Amino acid sequence: GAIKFWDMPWATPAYNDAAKKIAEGFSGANSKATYQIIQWNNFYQTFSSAIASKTGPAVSTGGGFQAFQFEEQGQIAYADKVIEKLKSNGQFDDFLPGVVEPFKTSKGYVAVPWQLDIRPLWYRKSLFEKAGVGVPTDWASLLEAGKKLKGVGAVGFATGSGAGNNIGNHLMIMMMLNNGGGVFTKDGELDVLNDRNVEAVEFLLELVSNGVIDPAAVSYTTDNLNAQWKDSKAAYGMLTLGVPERVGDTSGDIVVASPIAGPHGDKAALIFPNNIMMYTNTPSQEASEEFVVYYLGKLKELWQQKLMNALPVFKSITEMPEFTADPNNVKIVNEYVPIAKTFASQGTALSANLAALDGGQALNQFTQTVLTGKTDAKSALTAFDTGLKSVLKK
Numbered sequence: 199g200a201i202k203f204w205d206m207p208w209a210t211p212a213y214n215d216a217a218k219k220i221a222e223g224f225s226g227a228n229s230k231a232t233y234q235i236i237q238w239n240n241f242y243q244t245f246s247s248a249i250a251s252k253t254g255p256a257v258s259t260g261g262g263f264q265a266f267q268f269e270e271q272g273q274i275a276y277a278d279k280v281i282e283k284l285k286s287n288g289q290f291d292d293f294l295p296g297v298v299e300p301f302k303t304s305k306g307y308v309a310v311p312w313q314l315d316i317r318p319l320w321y322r323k324s325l326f327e328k329a330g331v332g333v334p335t336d337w338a339s340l341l342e343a344g345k346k347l348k349g350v351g352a353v354g355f356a357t358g359s360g361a362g363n364n365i366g367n368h369l370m371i372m373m374m375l376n377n378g379g380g381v382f383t384k385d386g387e388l389d390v391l392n393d394r395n396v397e398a399v400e401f402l403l404e405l406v407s408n409g410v411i412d413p414a415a416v417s418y419t420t421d422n423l424n425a426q427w428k429d430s431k432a433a434y435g436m437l438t439l440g441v442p443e444r445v446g447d448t449s450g451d452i453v454v455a456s457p458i459a460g461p462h463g464d465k466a467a468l469i470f471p472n473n474i475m476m477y478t479n480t481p482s483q484e485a486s487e488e489f490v491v492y493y494l495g496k497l498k499e500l501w502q503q504k505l506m507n508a509l510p511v512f513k514s515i516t517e518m519p520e521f522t523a524d525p526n527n528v529k530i531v532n533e534y535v536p537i538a539k540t541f542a543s544q545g546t547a548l549s550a551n552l553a554a555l556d557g558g559q560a561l562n563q564f565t566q567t568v569l570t571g572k573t574d575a576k577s578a579l580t581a582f583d584t585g586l587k588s589v590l591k592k
């Protein structure tokens with residue numbers, strides 16, 4: 199009977215309360231939807247195991263590239279009919295340019311975009327003032343300012359890789375991208391030991407050895423990391439859109455910082471093309487489709503209530519008074535969006551291999567190794583390369 203919708207803890211608990219009410223409001227196709235929260239820790243395995251044992255949902259959000267893995271396994275339901283319905287009802291024309299096309303394959307649309315989770319740098323003005331330093335413009339200035347911030351008891355580059363916390367993972371890849379590197383070649387081949395990647399990892403290790411990265415960062419959960427921001431421990435670091443609201447400190451002291459240049463002049467921001475996906479295990483495919491169209495139509499309410507930690511994929515939402523009046527949001531649009539790249543870099547096309555990269559053990563372990571300075575850059579990257587070859591399909 200009921201359409202099962204699984205959703206992640208995208209922002210604050212209040213995000214899930216609101217998304218629950220939206221979902222449970224669905225009464226289309228003489229059908230209903232149930233809402234269930236899947237935790238971030240081990241999410242890849244949670245979905246993989248549910249789908250394989252036929253106990254998974256009809257519809258879900260989840261990993262940025264998860265839909266490609268399940269499509270390869272033949273467990274996704276293509277979203278072509280949803281796309282048609284959005285064209286008829288008018289919503290399709292409201293999509294931002296380039297947001298739908300990444301999901302088009304030979305066999306259909308694997309999913310529908312719903313938000314863009316971008317990785318801005320943030321700072322706390324009071325702590326930069328206290329340390330007597332300026333906002334970094336590049337890696338060399340990040341390190342200098344970081345040392346001074348450490349000297350006044352602050353964390354110069356806040357991150358975390360504890361259970362449920364993927365921000366550390368994202369930092370590893372963001373810094374590679376920021377130095378003109380990336381996991382892949384232009385043609386989508388693995389290129390982990392590229393020299394720009396080595397430099398990026400050497401820089402992170404230097405932040406770790408100098409105490410600019412907190413020596414316990416490896417252990418920090420999402421709550422731990424948010425608390426560092428809320429309680430004026432974190433001076434600078436990479437997080438998400440809407441950090442003040444996410445951490446419960448809207449004094450105005452926490453502000454978006456400009457992107458910084460790598461040592462060769464490169465600029466990049468990391469972005470995740472998040473999407474809603476439908477599965478073959480549904481009591482009714484028509485109902486899955488109705489639910490998805492209904493849900494996309496109500497998404498504006500989440501940005502209206504300022505409950506999201508991501509960019510919208512709909513033009514009308516990006517023009518909503520609540521969105522543009524926040525200068526942090528405008529700075530992200532203007533300075534991060536134009537330089538944004540995904541995990542596919544230096545390729546562009548998305549694929550199932552991104553699912554294994556994003557959700558798998560190799561990236562997690564690489565991150566924890568770097569954040570503890572357990573080994574040298576080349577060794578860590580070689581272990582990373584090797585782990586990815588074990589799971590990616592060449």
Ligand SMILES: OC[C@H]1O[C@@H](O[C@@H]2[C@@H](O)[C@H](O)O[C@H](CO)[C@H]2O)[C@H](O)[C@@H](O)[C@@H]1O
Pocket residue numbers: 207208209238260261262263315362363364365367420438470471472507556557
């Ligand atoms: O790498 C796994 C997934 O990470 C998602 O980002 C999440 C943030 O939006 C949220 O605020 O924090 C959690 C826990 O750290 C993050 O995992 C990406 O948006 C996904 O695309 C990605 O699959």
